[PDB]
Ligand binder design. Structure first.
Ligand code: NA
Length: 129
């Protein structure tokens, strides 16, 4: 599924991500834009052989099991494939654990490099929320 900007903002709000760990909804929409272009089926292989999955590009190194990332953990207790669902519940649940891990949204390097410090409210501008 390829979400629209306000459609994803609504889905993230419904799943309690808005102001989670102090991150406003535009921060989460911005991170999703640059991680996946709002595509739930986005996958990207890392140089270290881990893979990133779904709207928030969650990494098999730590967070989900894909069976092909040696030495990795599965701290969200999910198959990485669940992060590719049209239903964002698994991605949201796992993103809440990631953003609680101690470095906040810096865990998402695209958030640090493209969202952090910017006018992230622009991402939810005009959305009925
Ligand atoms: Na893993």
């Amino acid at each position: 599924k390829v979400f629209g900007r306000c459609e994803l903002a609504a889905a993230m709000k419904r799943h309690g991500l808005d102001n989670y760990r102090g991150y406003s909804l535009g921060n989460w929409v911005c991170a999703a834009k640059f991680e996946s272009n709002f595509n739930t089926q986005a996958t990207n292989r890392n140089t270290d052989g881990s893979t990133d999955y779904g709207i928030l590009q969650i990494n098999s190194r730590w967070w989900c099991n894909d069976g092909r990332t040696p030495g990795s953990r599965n701290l969200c207790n999910i198959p990485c494939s669940a992060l590719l669902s049209s239903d964002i519940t698994a991605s949201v649940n796992c993103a809440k654990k990631i953003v609680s891990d101690g470095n906040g949204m810096n865990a998402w390097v695209a958030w640090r490099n493209r969202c952090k410090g910017t006018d992230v409210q622009a991402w939810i501008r005009g959305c009925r929320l």
